[PDB]
Amino acid sequence: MATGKIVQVIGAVVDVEFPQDAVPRVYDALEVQNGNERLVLEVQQQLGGGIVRTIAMGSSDGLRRGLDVKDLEHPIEVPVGKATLGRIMNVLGEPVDMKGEIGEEERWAIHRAAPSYEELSNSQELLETGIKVIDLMAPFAKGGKVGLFGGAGVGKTVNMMELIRNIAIEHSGYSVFAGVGERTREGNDFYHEMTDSNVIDKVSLVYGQMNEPPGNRLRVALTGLTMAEKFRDEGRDVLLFVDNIYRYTLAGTEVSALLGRMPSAVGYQPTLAEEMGVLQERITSTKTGSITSVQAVYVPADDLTDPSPATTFAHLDATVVLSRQIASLGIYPAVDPLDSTSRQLDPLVVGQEHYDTARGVQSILQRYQELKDIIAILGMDELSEEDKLVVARARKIQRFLSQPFFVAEVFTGSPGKYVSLKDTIRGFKGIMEGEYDHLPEQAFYMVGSIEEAVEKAKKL
Amino acid sequence: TGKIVQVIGAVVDVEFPQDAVPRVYDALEVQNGNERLVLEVQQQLGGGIVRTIAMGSSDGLRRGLDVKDLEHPIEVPVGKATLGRIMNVLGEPVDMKGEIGEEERWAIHRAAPSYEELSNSQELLETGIKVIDLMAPFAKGGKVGLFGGAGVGKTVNMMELIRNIAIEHSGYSVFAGVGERTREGNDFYHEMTDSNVIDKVSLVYGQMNEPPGNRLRVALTGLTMAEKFRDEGRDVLLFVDNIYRYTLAGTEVSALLGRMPSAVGYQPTLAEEMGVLQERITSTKTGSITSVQAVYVPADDLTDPSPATTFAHLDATVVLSRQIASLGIYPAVDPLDSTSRQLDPLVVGQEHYDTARGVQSILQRYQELKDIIAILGMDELSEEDKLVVARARKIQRFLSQPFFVAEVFTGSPGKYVSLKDTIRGFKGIMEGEYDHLPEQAFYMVGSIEEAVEKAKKL
Amino acid sequence: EFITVARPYAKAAFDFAVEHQSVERWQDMLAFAAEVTKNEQMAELLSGALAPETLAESFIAVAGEQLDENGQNLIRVMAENGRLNALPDVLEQFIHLRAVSEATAEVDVISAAALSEQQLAKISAAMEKRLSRKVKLNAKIDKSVMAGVIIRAGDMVIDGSVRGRLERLADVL
Amino acid sequence: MQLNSTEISELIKQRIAQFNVVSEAHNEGTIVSVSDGVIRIHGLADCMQGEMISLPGNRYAIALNLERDSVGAVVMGPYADLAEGMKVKCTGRILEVPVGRGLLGRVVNTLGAPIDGKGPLDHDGFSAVEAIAPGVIERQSVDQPVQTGYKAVDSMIPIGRGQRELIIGDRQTGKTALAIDAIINQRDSGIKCIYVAIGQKASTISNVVRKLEEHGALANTIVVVATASESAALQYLAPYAGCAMGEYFRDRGEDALIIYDDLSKQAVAYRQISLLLRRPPGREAFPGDVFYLHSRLLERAARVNAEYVEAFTKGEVKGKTGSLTALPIIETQAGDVSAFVPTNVISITDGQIFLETNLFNAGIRPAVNPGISVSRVGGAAQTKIMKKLSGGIRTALAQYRELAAFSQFASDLDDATRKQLDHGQKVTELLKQKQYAPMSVAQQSLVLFAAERGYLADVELSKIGSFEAALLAYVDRDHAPLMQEINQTGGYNDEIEGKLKGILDSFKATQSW
Amino acid sequence: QLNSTEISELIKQRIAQFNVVSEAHNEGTIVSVSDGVIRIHGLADCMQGEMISLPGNRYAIALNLERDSVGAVVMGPYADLAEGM
Amino acid sequence: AQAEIEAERKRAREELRKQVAILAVAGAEKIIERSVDEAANSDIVDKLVAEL
Amino acid sequence: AQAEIEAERKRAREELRKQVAILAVAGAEKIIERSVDEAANSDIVDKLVAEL
Ligand SMILES: Nc1ncnc2c1ncn2[C@@H]1O[C@H](COP(=O)(O)OP(=O)(O)OP(=O)(O)O)[C@@H](O)[C@H]1O
Ligand SMILES: Nc1ncnc2c1ncn2[C@@H]1O[C@H](COP(=O)(O)OP(=O)(O)O)[C@@H](O)[C@H]1O
Ligand SMILES: Nc1ncnc2c1ncn2[C@@H]1O[C@H](COP(=O)(O)OP(=O)(O)O)[C@@H](O)[C@H]1O
Ligand SMILES: [Mg+2]
Ligand SMILES: [Mg+2]
């Protein structure tokens, strides 16, 4: 039965008054009949006097005062498990594609505590991505956060699709994609690019886009996360994509200003760091399973000091930057080896050979970076015959970072390659010390492992 | 007679019978558990309520406690008996020794002297510090201020001035520690007792461990002692350890007294809280007070309201800077911002004045050149501009000096450079007499004759 | 809530009703004036802005059970400040001030089941030592406190239940 | 073996034995509001500020305001499940925390409740979380040395027992590495350690705990943890719970060492708690008293003279003197050391070790920037040998690091700069040191000897790194008694100068490296 | 909620007589004191900018004329002035 | 590897103590609810009043 | 050692079952002293035994 009544409505914020003894607890979900359809309200505060203040997970137009409100006794619950693969959902777990119901056996609340201290894994492993640039220059910690910083046209979404493919096929995990606050168009022509690549059967999509009320854009990141947590509890390894964490922070600021709390550092809510932490703290490697996150980060005003980036970066373990220039040079994936970083590049955690190989190729490329500007102005003739060999090797290292993805076949017909880590370490140990100086640079381009680079070189 | 009714932070509120309500600045008392807590009233709210600031820890206070109305303000021991002893803000002895045998006690809230009574002195005061008494000479019986951000050296400079002025001087002295480290108060106390000058210094301490109620008023009870020694016909030295904390303790409390915030959060009464203090610390016809005040500037920002309102209250302002201490050039005084009321040809003599203005002129001309040096490199300078850069970089070093109190940090022994000798050395550098020495000959030396020797070693 | 704004009005009403020896009449008058405030149509009138003297005059007219000068004067003052909604709490604080003035108390006794009719007498006999006040034990039952008794006097409670002892044990372990 | 049913049964039976069946009278109130972590309570006519109010479940709320009609309190834990109308109880206790040496080796919540699995605590009673530090007369001047594992800070930035030394730098610069290298090195030097992590990631805390247990230090540390997920009222009150445990050893004439990991995150949690109470912000939106917050915490770290110990301890401990060293860690954005919070702390401590991202990315690790870093006690804290061997080295490098600036294109004074510039370069190449590799006063002393007495400018810059690895084994084989004496006493004499010259000559001549 | 100089011993007078006795419009009483500002109760005939004369030889300037208050600023030392003057 | 097992002995011991300790109080609840249904209540309510 | 602990755990776990019946009585009869609680206890205590 319905035991409450709406008492105020101001934009997205609805105040309802309950009996003195039956007040909903915070984060509980209410629902009202907004005319011809139901609307769900998530509680935020218990003002005194039986009243409680809530945010509508939808449009609030048409809400009269005095409507009846039905108090559900539990937080927002969403469907989880295998049944949600290949489907699309909005925050509240309703199917938002046209395929009909979800036959899920189980539903979970989206608010829960992070893994307690002694549940965490007593180890520190690497997620083998199968991509040369990533696995060499910016390895992924299994159960860590990764920030993907490139812009547009550089291939962010094809990178994400290749990661989905590799984590589902070569390992035996699933993936979740939470589209926080981004263009509807991109969500549509991402969903389509994934169905025509047959990865759609291994990823579960949830969408809250720019057109949604603040209550939708805010919590959607927790729905995807609480599906990934279900896959984790089944003992799997999961990969969780957040389409823009900055818009998560911004939906938090909008809701905060709606509730009327004082602003803090640069207009951001007072609870910025906690709203971020209670999300980023559920993405970890428990003894049973892992969640690994790949999070597209937008940095406002090109400022790495603004409180939003300054908070996000405190949680990221790796950082891969995509570059327009490396793309125009025709190398794909267009990762930037110099700006990409990972705090797993330490001899202790990755070993000495991997470490010093990555460091070597980095120094090679960053000398070439200036030899190229010598050449630009003085011409190739001026260089020492040491630097001409440095250039000839830098160009081959640069080529060897290219790779054919299983998902890129559509574009280039070449069958995609999965490059185990050992092969990358060997390939670069090789090139960097003159071995394979005897074969041309185009024999490295788009090849795969080096034990295929030679066999391509054989028949140019 | 009277009950507590709210205890928000440090501001307690008390309700009194309509006819018994205390006056402003009266002192109340509460029996806080197994403690005795003193409250000072700030406002008479309406209807018998009165609002107060707790001179102690506010924890443990319940609503409804009985409070006792003392009929007099906070009063502190005063006179010769308070000499060579450490005291609380409340005038209680804080060393382990016995009672203070004071004859007399004075209320710490007083009116400033009248305009008719003030007195002026051009009598210059000599300190061994080179930069200070070249750029910012200051006069017996006048305020000095050491402005600077954290870590820049405004406490080492004050201990140097204590060493150079206070031991070579006969009258009594007062050191009021407002909101700075207790470690340093202990180190100072033992440094005095280990040279027997303790029995001429009177100490008061409201160090940073203490609650706001103590740091707020501790400076006034140091004044109230220096004021006695002044009115007795003596002349006194008064060193205040950080007068910035006297306003910060006010900002901390103002929000609770229900007062709308001003420009950067500060209390709306900032300039008056500061004036009513800085105005009682002045010399007069019956005596004189010579005072050095350390003045913290927050976030190194000299435009902040709290430093900005203080410049007007001082005679000689010495402004330290971090971008000079980072070059190792101690004392890191900024000679293009240090100033003095006394740097005038009639007060200081024409030659000293012309030397100071020459140093400023060419350090400034050096400042203008730095952008083109940083972009185009030094080689694009005129041939008589490279000369200016090379003389300015010499002057910058020669303003450096090794203090007697910085041995702990550098080993090298201290120096005391008389005025007659610094105004000769700087003429030497400016007129190109020493235009054949390497810069490092001038770093951390005393007279110009110690630079020329050091140059023999390279 | 109005507890903090009802205090001055309650104290003034009681300070006045004492001097004229009219506490018993003032309490009933205040209770009536509080009950009118709860009415369907009157509460609507009290919200929508209306000139205080006009709101008071419309309010007085609904109360012929108010003494000719002082009750109506209280209503006028509260209407001027715009606090007529506070009345239901001016009543609470008036009754509490009276209970203090008459050195009287009123305590709950919560039990698994009713008591022996001498146990009540012994409880009251005990309580009038803890409290100087004369006490009226109004008794209640709650079988979740399956044995023992809870005594609550104001914001002091003395918990003699078995349920209490079990919850207190289960956390010592 | 140690899962004997009978001992568990007796452990419980004891609790049954000493159970006070007698009731007790307590004071009660009702929750009236809940929002974003703050509670509003009616009643509690006898709650006292700073008190612990006990909620349903087993959790506490701290009274911050006693307004005229309501008490304002912050929940110390998850607050979602609290509902208007719930009853609460006023305990008689100002905020308290368990203390004792029985905590050593335990990982503990900010309220003392153990967070590892290893069961309840053994503790010597309780101590108040908010206390006022010893006064000016109870102190003593810091004299004794605290050795970290490192050349760079033990020579240039010495730390004494009872000092407060800020570690400040950018993020990912080796602040926590240097801190837990300080903790590991006291594994055997008799001073107990405490590591309080505020706002850290939970995984990182489990990782540092794993290293602490792996190098054998954990049995000598207390670990206080309030992770990024936990309510702000826990994070902002965490370091006071750490000082409450450090002060247990300070007062008993023992020595302690406490590390506040990222006081920046404590300031952020306090800014949150403040703004949710509608208090007027100030500079950078921090509250007005964000200074006093750190002031009253770091000031507790102190060294107390023996009369204070004898008075506190009721005359049981005689003649000894206690101390509590503190190493707060601050993070600064973009290397800007002039922001409101970094300056507030630079103004409270007795120095700072500034770790520079530009050196750290160049391979110089630990990336100690000389010129910004200082120790406000300086040489008083060093062992007799070190105060000699150090010379003015820190200004030597602070100069070399601007001779290296102007010498980027052209310079004068050529051949003297040549040798200044080579000494500086091989010295910096010598001060870099690997992680988890602490070197003793005797190991570090002979290396500074080899640095300042020549034995240099001949060996290759690439060989500096192995000259050391060979020398420290050569002296570990042959002259071990001399290392054993220099470790036992600071010991500076011209017998030891002679012996060190002899050892280093014989190494330079006989051995390969 | 907030109270605005509605306090027990004022309210009692209205209880006894709400229709205010025509008390001299030439005078009032101090109800509050703080930081150099005083709130005066009464003074129906106060005019903005007028000078209000206090015990001793002191004056205040009426700046805020409100409903049931006159907010005036004291000229010279204010610490002496006490509610009920 | 030895401390790593010592910690596990401690942790398992505690894990077991927890279960025994909660089942104790559950058993006391039911036992108490079976046996105080009599005039035993009259003793409890009279016990505190002598100390009340 | 982790496999050995899984044996020691069960070894102790089985035997404690006989001690829960002692501890439940000790607690309940601490909290209310006027009970034999041995006359009619089988239904309660045997499923206390069972849970461990
Ligand atoms: N002496 C050293 N030599 C080489 N690498 C080091 C050294 N000290 C620390 N590091 C490396 O620096 C990295 C970051 O160290 P650490 O986490 O202690 O810095 P931090 O400032 O605590 O980072 P954060 O601020 O993110 O916690 C570590 O991965 C460690 O491997
Ligand atoms: N690895 C790759 N193989 C083949 N083509 C690629 C690859 N990466 C990027 N491209 C081309 O670059 C274009 C990038 O466009 P798009 O993927 O829409 O950018 P984003 O995904 O960043 O929004 C793609 O259309 C694709 O044709
Ligand atoms: N004359 C000096 N010689 C050498 N070092 C100095 C000198 N003055 C300051 N310093 C260094 O700068 C620090 C400044 O100390 P202090 O003045 O106490 O700081 P603050 O200015 O914040 O009070 C000293 O600890 C010392 O390390
Ligand atoms: Mg100082
Ligand atoms: Mg760290």
Does residue D221 sit in helix, strand or coil?
strand
Q: Among partner residues B57, B58, B94, which is closest to D135 by beta-carbon distance?
A: B94
**How many Å apart are CA D153 and CA D174, to the nearest integer?**
13
Q: D199 and A20 in contact by Cβ < 8 A?
A: no
Preceding amide of B331 cis, omega within 30? yes
Ligand 2: atom nearest CA of A405 is 1
D512 touching F (Cβ < 8 Å): no
- Rounded to whole angstroms, the Cα distance separating A276 from A282 reads 11
Task: Give the type of residue at C2.
Answer: F
Distance, in Å, from the CA atom of D349 to the CA atom of D327, rounded to the nearest integer, reads: 9
Atom of ligand 3 at shortest range from CA of B410: 4
Residue of E10, E35, E83 lying closest to B269 (CB–CB): E35
**What is the spatial distance between Cα D255 and Cα D321, in angstroms, rounded to a whole number?**
8
- Helices C40-47 and C23-37: crossing angle in degrees, nearest 10, is 80
Angle at alpha carbon of residue D281, lines to D278 and D287, rounded to 5°: 95
B180 flagged as catalytic: yes
Q: Are B73 and B55 in contact (CB under 8 A)?
A: no
Q: Does G31 touch chain C (CB under 8 A)?
A: yes
Subunits in contact with chain F (3 or more CB pairs closer than 8 Å): C, D, G
- Amino acid present at A397: I
| Widest Cα–Cα separation across chain E | 39
Expressed in angstroms and rounded, the spacing between residue D172 Cα and the centre of ligand 5 is 7
Tell whether D12 is within 8 A of chain F (Cβ). yes
Q: Which residues contact B324 (CB under 8 A, 6 or more apart)?
A: B332, B333, B334
Instruction: Copy the structure tokens of residue A430.
Output: 């090789």
Is residue B52 within 8 A of residue B42, CB to CB? The reply is yes
Fold that domain C2-100 belongs to in CATH:
Peroxidase; domain 1 (1.10.520)
**CB B150 less than 6 A from any atom of ligand 3:** yes
CB A284 within 8 A of CB D203: yes
Contact B239, B175 (CB under 8 A): yes
* Those residues with Cβ within 8 angstroms of residue B152's Cβ, 6 or more apart along the chain or in another chain: B320, B321, B322, B325, B332
Catalytic member of D283, D376, D418, D453? D376
For residue E28, how far is the Cα from the chain centroid? 5
H or E segment and range at residue D8: helix D5-17
3-class DSSP state of B406: coil
d(CA G9, CA G5): 6
Nearest CA-CA partner of C89 in A197, D42, D335? D42
Q: For residue D2, give how far its alpha carbon lies from the nearest alpha carbon of chain G (Å).
A: 9
For residue E5, give the chain B residue with the closest CA.
B46
- Listed in sequence order, the residues at least 6 apart from D138 whose beta carbon sits closer than 8 Å to its beta carbon are D304, D305, D307, D308
Query: What is the spatial distance between Cα A209 and Cα A196, in angstroms, rounded to a whole number?
Result: 23
Q: Can you list the pairs that C81-84 forms with residues at least 24 positions away whose Cβ atoms lie under 8 Å?
A: C81/E4, C81/E6, C82/C52, C83/C2, C83/C5, C83/C6, C83/C9, C84/C37, C84/C46, C84/C55, C84/C59
Examine residue C8 and say whether the peptide bond preceding it is cis (omega within 30 degrees of 0).
no
The CB of D332 under 6 Å from ligand 1? The reply is no
Return the amino acid letter for B347.
Answer: V
Domains in chain B: ranges and CATH = 1-73 (2.40.10.170), 74-342 (3.40.50.300), 343-458 (1.10.1140.10)
Half-sphere exposure of residue B417: CA atoms within 13 angstroms, side-chain side: 27
Q: H-helix or E-strand containing A255?
A: helix A245-259
The CB density around residue A265, as the number of other CB atoms within 10 Å, is 19
Distance separating alpha carbons of residues D75 and D38, to the nearest angstrom: 6
Alpha-carbon E59 to chain mean position:
13
Probe site for chain C from F16, F49, F51 (most C CB atoms < 10 A): F49
Backbone CA torsion sign across D138, D143, D144, D145: positive
Instruction: Report resolution in angstroms.
Output: 3.3
Chain A nearest-CA residue for D340: A265
3 state DSSP class of B299: helix
Q: DSSP states of D20-34 as a string?
A: --S--EEEEEEEEEE
- For residue A72 the two structure tokens come to 């559900």
Give me the count of residues in chain E. Answer: 85
Q: Could you tell me which residues come within 8 angstroms of residue A157 by beta carbon, excluding any fewer than 6 positions away?
A: A186, A190, A193
Residues of chain C neighbouring F25 (CB-CB closer than 8 A)? 166, 169-170, 173
DSSP calls for B42-93:
EEB-STTEEEEEESS--TTPBTT-BEEEEEEE-EEEESGGGTT-EE-TTS-B
CA of D376, nearest ligand number: 3
How does strand B26-30 pair with strand B37-43?
antiparallel
* DSSP E strand boundaries for C39-173: 104-111, 134-141, 149-153, 156-159
Distance from CA of D134 to the nearest CA of F (A): 38
What span, in angstroms and rounded, lies between the C-alpha atoms of A131 and A406?
11
Give the relative orientation of helices B270-278 and B244-254 as an angle to the nearest 10 degrees.
140
CA B343 to chain centre: 21
From the centroid of its chain, how far is CA D99?
18
| Tokens (6 digits) for B194 | 């280990």
Would the CB atoms of A120 and D203 count as touching at under 8 Å?
Answer: yes
Give me the count of residues in chain A.
Answer: 460
SS3 letters for D313-381?
Answer: CCCCCCCCCEEEEECCEEECHHHCCCCHHHHHHHCCCCEEEEECHHHHHCCCCCCECECCEEECCHHHH
Element (H, E) at G31: helix G2-31
Rounded CA separation D52/D93 (Å): 6
Give, rounded to a whole angstrom, the gap between the first and last alpha carbons of chain A: 78
Chains in contact with A via at least 3 Cβ–Cβ pairs below 8 Å: D
- For residue D505 the two structure tokens come to 């000559």
Do B227 and B112 meet the contact criterion of CB atoms below 8 Å apart?
Answer: no
CB A53 within 8 A of CB A44: yes
Calculated CA dihedral for residues A163, A167, A169, A173, nearest 10 degrees: -150
Amino acid at A80: V
Q: Are B24 and D13 in contact (CB under 8 A)?
A: no
HSE toward the beta carbon, residue D35, CA cutoff 13 A: 21
Nearest-CA distance D125 → chain B (Å): 20
Question: Bridge-partner residues for C134, per DSSP?
Answer: C104
In chain B, residues with a C-beta closer than 8 Å to the C-beta of D398 are 328
B376 lines ligand 3 (CB under 6 A): no
Q: Locate the chain D residue with the closest alpha carbon to A272.
A: D272
Both tokens assigned to A77: 């619950």
Ligand 3 atom closest to the CA of B406, numbered from 1: 3
Taking the C-alpha atoms of residue C112 and residue C145, their distance in angstroms, rounded to an integer, is: 5
Nearest CA to ligand 2 atom 15: A153
Distances (CA, A) of F24 to C147, C161, D121, G24: 19, 19, 21, 5
Q: Which residue has the tokens 């000959």?
A: B441
Pairing mode, if any, of strands B173-178 and B201-206?
parallel
Kindly list the distances between the CA atom of residue A141 and the CA atoms of A123, A285, C136, D33, E77, in Å, as whole numbers in the listed order. 11, 9, 70, 43, 70
Instruction: Check pocket membership of B149 for ligand 3, CB cut-off 6 A.
Output: no
C-alpha F52/C-alpha D23 separation (Å) is 9
Verify whether residue D210 is a known catalytic residue: no
Closest to D331 measured CA to CA, from D281, D409, D267, D405: D267
Ligand 1 center–CA D88 separation, angstroms: 45
- In this structure, the dihedral spanned by the alpha carbons of residues F23, F24, F26 and F30, taken in order and rounded to 10 degrees, is 130
Residues A203 and A176: beta-carbon distance below 8 Å: yes
Of E1, E2, E15, the CB nearest to C12: E15
With a CB-CB cutoff of 8 Å, which residues 75-114 of chain C face chain E?
76-77, 81
- The residues near A27 (Cβ < 8 Å, ≥ 6 apart) are A42, A43, A44, A75, A111, D80
Give the domains, in start order, of chain E with CATH numbers. 1-85 (2.40.30.20)
| Probe target for ligand 1 pocket from D365, D431, D433, with the most ligand atoms within 8 Å of CB | D365
Q: Which amino acid is at G50?
A: A
